[model samples]
Target chain A: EQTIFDHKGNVIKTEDREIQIISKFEEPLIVVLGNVLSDEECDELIELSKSKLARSKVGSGAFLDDNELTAKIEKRISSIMNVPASHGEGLHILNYEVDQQYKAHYDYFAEHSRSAANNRISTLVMYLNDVEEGGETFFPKLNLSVHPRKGMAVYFEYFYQDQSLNELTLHGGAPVTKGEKWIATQWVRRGTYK
Target chain B: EQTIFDHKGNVIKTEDREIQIISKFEEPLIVVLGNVLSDEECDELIELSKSKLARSKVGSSSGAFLDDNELTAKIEKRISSIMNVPASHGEGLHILNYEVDQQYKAHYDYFAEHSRSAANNRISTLVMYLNDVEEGGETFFPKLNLSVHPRKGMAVYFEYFYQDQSLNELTLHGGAPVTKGEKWIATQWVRRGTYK
Candidate 1:
């Protein structure tokens, strides 16, 4: 089995937290990391992004557009992911209320958009709070479902070593049934992203 | 920071099921492992131990004493491998059974400081769940306010001994009464060193 590790070569094992490699679907390597953020940190991020929330054109959800708060959130994500802050895109805080959902989509840029934008190499999505029911990050091809849990994060790599897009990376957020869903997403670029 | 591992030196890392290191409290290290056992193995073990059940004096529970034999050698090896401990360091496996309202109250698994058996103190514990309980049957840690529900094949591990031979108080735990289905579990207790 291919083992997952942090940049430090550590197996991503810690006394206080854990990282479970849920799937190694070559197309999209996925893992779930627990205790990515503390309860207070999750609440603070939500509070900071509230005022900047706006409808997202890509999904039936709201997003946070504040560059100032985005920087702070990006730094935390970079620290946890062991990636440089500059390699990450601005934080995208998403909120999905009851009946709202994100249609399936790929995080990597399209062939046409690749020339203008850096391709998304990986994604780190942290759940700000838990959903009572429904709300799950579903990977249709792999039939993998990730239920929302406070402070836990779901991570996956869409681009393989050769930088090829993996259609198996396609995923979407299931509609929230009983309660709302909040997530902080960070997309890491293959190269330094301005 | 102290590290825990079996004799194989492999970091007790797994991906088949989820594992959450619930607490890093230095005094007591606790981790919850999911899917430690498969449904088939659990059923087989319960079947094998069924005839050996006897009421446990420690609590309102019944336990099956697994004597060393080929019948249990496979499970013993499995537990040692997952715990990264030597088979010789582990005491015989204990299969505990509990019915509705049955519980084992909070207690220490280690020998008392003033007891004559201090030298034989238990160092770690790995409790494997053989079946799930519909309600209750949670493992509660009063000091940490943590209640772990029974999940088939899941296991809970905790260390209560330091290298210096002192016991940690943070490991005090108890089984909550079963409100619904019966509970079955296999427990492995490791000693400070090799056990006869």
Candidate 2:
């Protein structure tokens, strides 16, 4: 397991958040960070994306349609992931109500999709709110499950430096058995995204 | 690595604090929990242990040496409940107070490896913070590069011996000097079997 330490050789911390290395799996690097967003910032993102929510095809949930208000969130994600803001796609907000879920899927682009555009190298998902009962992020191959917590974010890298996909990165959102769940996801590409 | 999940498989919350597992090192079986106590409980414990303060022998700090004090029984009960260990498994609670420049160098809580009495060997430790210091006074794990700053109500736990009775070096830790405000803490050491 690779220990992810801050530049100070200690646990990482942002302006107001603390970062704890939850898992250091080499196959697909995963890190859980606390306080990735402030309470106010979470509310702001939800408010902006609320009106644009649409039923998701991949999961029994709703997704915020691409809109102009996501630029600020994209910048924040880029800074946290230590990637270029231009390399990230617009923030995707997901809302899961009772029994809603997302099946296991890879975030990287398919061969055809890669040829048309840049491949998604990494992904950063921020939990916008805590679920009252269920709703966990599960990595099947890794056998890891991360529960929802407001202001906490989970990051993982799937595409290797050689552009090879990491099968261990296959993950999905568990069904929300009780309260609603909200998450804002940012996908970073290999090259600058339009 | 053994993941120590609370019964609910989520963050554990006490009356006023949220307990989050920061690390689960399998080698020495060390687990660092954040916000294991509350600010009110910290202050209350400090007040309860204040009158029993005395110079500490091993470390250059003072402690509420409650072994012979009547308050020992109550504090021990409270600590046992929080640590989820039987009162008989724990030594009396020791509330340590470190002033400016005081420090406790790296050392193990367990007895010598060759000690004849297996029952006397310390198995685990629960170090609870009673107050926060302004600067310095961090619980330093030298080999791990982990420096836990003093945060009132938070606690750090580590086991020096496995279930098979093997000693672990990863449990070695020390206290950095107090550069600003005083540091107050209460520690409970649980033995392998039972204490005399």
Candidate 3:
């Protein structure tokens, strides 16, 4: 298990050991920052999201993404992007059950995910559910397991050179064990690079 | 002059300071904060604020003593009341400024400021300015001179408190000198009480 490094190259301690998924891809991806939110705030945001709808990439595009919840999350990312010109785009949510898993794949602007080509520079995934066990985003290349937590987020970049998206950052969501899994994903564009 | 402390009673280091003048206010009010918008991120926020109008405290009829800003400020206090908890709230700003030769008198909101009234647990004052100045505006704590530059925010929280708002004595601050442009400030006061 390799230790996570801060922007300054200092090792960041992790409570648990998980396999790295984004590493399997061709390009090197990094986790910029991550944190968890309280359930109370989550509930409040869920209530405030009554009228807002969100478009889902893998799921139904008919449902509205909770605006209030999105705003709260945006403010947090905005602060994180403060140091570097990090993009603050969000991702689609998908619920996975036991034995259900996504195959390994890269997250570049491939034809399947071409809709996200316009404003994507980096990608972030937040685990919104606490699976009883299992259910990790795995990258066989890197051997990573990104477990789900209420507010925990996983971030990675998609593009590298002059608007060229990274094609090798192959990754996918694993199956869950006891409980269902809910995850949120976000893709940031590259207008202002750090 | 005695040094001021933060809510934890640690002596607070003097940073940037300023005198803020709202419309019709007699004396200029002092503003101080921890740091100004020195980072690139803060600069972006400043750019985003180009078209936004700065808000001032409009007088409220219900709370005659409280200005518009004061009334709005109290709303947070009221929410604290609902939570059955009491504590100081922090404040931030998109922009602020100070005027030429304009000055705020050195004063404390703590017990020392109100010697005749019951001692209240008032914490330290914190001010943050949004823009830059040419000269004159500096934060004065009696003899200490804490000069603040633009693009940085300042803060002065409290170090002491009592059970009663009027009986807790701990808030004090002052603003001095504005030789150039008008100074802007955002302030917050912490108290010792809880809603629960």
Candidate 4:
């Protein structure tokens, strides 16, 4: 098997793809990261996604526990997203086509009394493809639109230590007009999601 | 921004950056910021060098300044905002990596008074830790017998200037040798004036 794990258990790449802090907002705690995914990782994911797109999670689901690739990738994601791997759901590969858009929705359940830690606390959306036209992650409340760029990621936190949700996190994918958009979205919960 | 003064005295607050204040020091003014960056951020910086790290002569670690584009730009922006210093005043950021038993001896950020009293002298410093060490690499202030342990995402903030036309000796500090694991840090020093 080809190696992707270093001594520190990091995903290996032929070339270095360091993460960049593009923009950071202090108020709502929004962080834009660049070069989050390697081209190889993105391509592998897209192929796997094509092989599994119809499966679900693009709607209200995520890919099931995958092979070593996903496990290693999730381990990498755990570090950057600042959450334990056990606290995250499997990678939710969301593909948006032209004229298709996801309306604004909170990642949490619609205001239930379940354990606060069980709900989504933060989200990391890593873009796998560069879109020509639309398909930006639009945050109306924050008045921010992040363009699709291969290997870039958008991070946002809505839940606090107390588990109260921040409506300021209202966001969704804008309509894809030109090129299709492929993204691997990871939702982090306060407690174990596995 | 004005420094806050309480029943104590003038000092900058690290309350922002979502940073936690683990310990506070007076006179010399120090703030320990916990959880300033995620582990991923630290790992990225550790692998950033294009060439090899040469042993530093600055007096325990290897030092290198990252190029502008890649990831250094965004991190510099965050550093400026957190320190409340204009980006123009930032001395270029230096990343320090040290192995077990390697350490920086006592040193001060300020100068030999080429331009003192807010000309272009170093006013403040923000040293951010990238990873946790098994043992040492603590930022130790010997005169005060105070220290900030090397915690991943933790930062040590301090300001040293002439209180009464005399340098603040209490602000002198250094990095202790790493007893166990390696240590990585991102250090940014702020100048009194627009730093070219």
Candidate 5:
């Protein structure tokens, strides 16, 4: 009876267009969103990130500077999430070849040294390309895996109602078993960053 | 902004149990549901179906209509509550099994005008996942861009009938091919009026 589905219908509003929420999970608030970006937007992002692609554990990937295109996309994400664009970090574009993977981890900080108000609140990963076979974003706790469909985004937020983190958001990239995978990640924090 | 989801909460109430609507669509009125049945019920259906299973392919899948039993009756009642269709309007409970590489092709659930009764025709369908597979075997609705992976005790339901008695072809869907392990499922179709 209790679910965090506050949105009204299948469609969520954006500045330019209406995007669809394809699926959702309540325990950890996972939502698979479609039409998060246009096909042209996805291609342009891939072209921009191709030469600069590098593996990163944290703070090591190619952080894209907001251009006219990325700025609009970033603003669109904030509209969908109902958060301020000022609280978002620069978009991080990552590429994974066949058999590459990212281990399960939470988006929020855990060190306890920094205030929880400044930690990450959510993530919206825009999939730029489709795989012929097996690239998925898997949440270990929910036992859920979402296929990387072009222009669709997988969104999950761990910031709970009581202000503590939900461990069920533990997610990572499933190895690309077939073709290559590309994604643009947007991170939202509770407080604005310089 | 438009969807056919009139129900208020995620868990739709049945007389006995509450079922979850995990995903939904607007144009076609599609709904992916979870916890339609319990773990014990899933295992019970598979065990009871072992003897009468008619193997073939609609999508090259094997299946057969199950005979009426206590468990089947219990399931039918639950579905009637979830769908809000009387038990008399439903077709027989069907059990299906799919091997690796097998699948059901995309097709409309609504019958053609001349092929079915004018007063009593299919209004909705419920496909329940009976067991987990290693990968693949998702229920896919291409027009809607909706793909639901097979998970034990989860089910998908959609209504094609409109207020004007027109059927929504956008509800067209089928079981995708299983790439790794096999799959087991139970399907139930509900009619617009009492079925003979």
Candidate 6:
């Protein structure tokens, strides 16, 4: 497994897709994961997404619309499989068609969801393809931009229990003025996330 | 076109990518323009890189990577496409593909970067990300992650310039790990940063 588990025992495998854990970090840390997809696979998805477009939380969350890949991803990273890096609901993939846009916003697991007999711990996002123009991720508060690249991933953790977004980091996906954008996202649940 | 320059001075693009000026604060501020990649864009770049990536100031030097869309662009509240907000860095973006790991850091912009050029202002940081991932990452200063989020941006300013990484309230940012892969980020460098 890739993660370390706590009192909840270890992440298990299911015929259906589910998240497992790998390792747990007591302190906050930035972890990036990659190699989840190959260039051919990425290209295939990009091509398929040309038609199966869907609106996402921020932008269009559409892609080739396959379940096999999702299942594969889940099997690899599930809390049961890894134990340390498992997430709950809020898993999604944003697929942006030309000129699609998602305004800036923050991510917070709902209070009900956070305490729904389970705790929300961290958030994970995986970028699948790189778009052409525009489509740059923007941080309204931070003043930074991360351009597109294939196969690489960005990882960050938000552990604020207050649930106030005023001071929370606010970000958005810039319009893809030129090409398309595709990505996968997961929100981790906490066994002890109170 | 997005930035509000003092005295209506002509915008001269420099190699530094940083636009030096007085801040909106009553006192002084040090604003450094970091990377800007939208969530989608950042993800794309992260996928593009073959190696794990990270960024830091080896000294009081300039940031790495330069090209089209590499330099910093400022948009003020009054500008046409700009956002109307208070003492803010407007909407920016970034991407860090490797670990900003292992380093006791401090906060304190060089005096020459500000209008006052003396270092008597508060310095703050607004860290933003387009995505989220797993493992070995946290923002800290003695004991604080500042709780950074991938979808939402983060902000951590400072009130003093300590010259050393002695765990001051003013200096906060602990680059965690790439136990999985990479970390992409956008940051707001503020003057007279808030010290907790």
A37-96 per-residue lDDT for model 6 (tens digits): 466656655555455554365644532333555445555445322333334453366777
Give the candidate number with the greatest DockQ.
2
Which 10-residue span in candidate 3 chain B carries the lowest summed lDDT? B18-27
Give the clashing residue pairs of candidate 1, or none: B6-B84, B6-B85
Minimum summed lDDT over a 10-residue window in model 6 chain A is located at: A1-10
Those runs of model 6 whose alpha carbons end farther than 4 Å from true positions after fitting are: A1-36, A47-69, A78-91, A112-121, A142-145, A162-167, A191-194, B1-196
Measured by TM-score, how close is model 3 to the native structure? 0.36
Q: After superposition, how far is residue A17 of candidate 2 from its true place, in Å?
A: 7.9
In terms of lDDT, the poorest run of 10 residues in model 2 chain B is: B1-10
Deviation of model 4 at A49, angstroms: 1.1
Query: In candidate 2 chain A, what residue range of length 10 has the lowest lDDT sum?
Result: A1-10
lDDT, candidate 5, B153-193, per-residue tens: 88888887776443377678888888888899999988877
lDDT digits (tens) for residues B54-157 of candidate 6: 45456853222211133233222121111112334322333344443432244333344355633444333444343454443443343322322222121222
Per-residue accuracy of model 3 over B123-181 as CA lDDT, tens digit each = 43444443444444544334221222332332322233443433222223355577656
- Candidate DockQ values, in order, are 0.03, 0.14, 0.01, 0.01, 0.03, 0.04
lDDT of 6: 0.40
Name the runs in model 2 displaced over 4 angstroms.
Answer: A1-29, A53-70, A97-106, A109-117, A133-146, A158-180, B1-6, B13-32, B39-52, B55-82, B92-114, B120-123, B127-187, B192-196
TM-score for the first chain of model 6? 0.58
Per-residue alpha-carbon lDDT of candidate 3 for residues A31-85, written as tens digits (9 for 90 to 100): 4222434556444443433435445678521222445556566555443333122
TM-score of each: 0.48, 0.62, 0.36, 0.45, 0.52, 0.40
Query: Which has the higher TM-score value, candidate number 1 or candidate number 4?
Result: 1
Give per-candidate clash totals: 2, 0, 72, 3, 3, 113
- Scanning candidate 4 chain A in windows of ten residues, the lowest lDDT window is A1-10
DockQ of 1: 0.03
TM-score of chain B of each: 0.81, 0.75, 0.44, 0.80, 0.87, 0.40
Q: What CAPRI-style quality would you assign to candidate 5?
A: incorrect
Show the colliding residue pairs in model 2: none
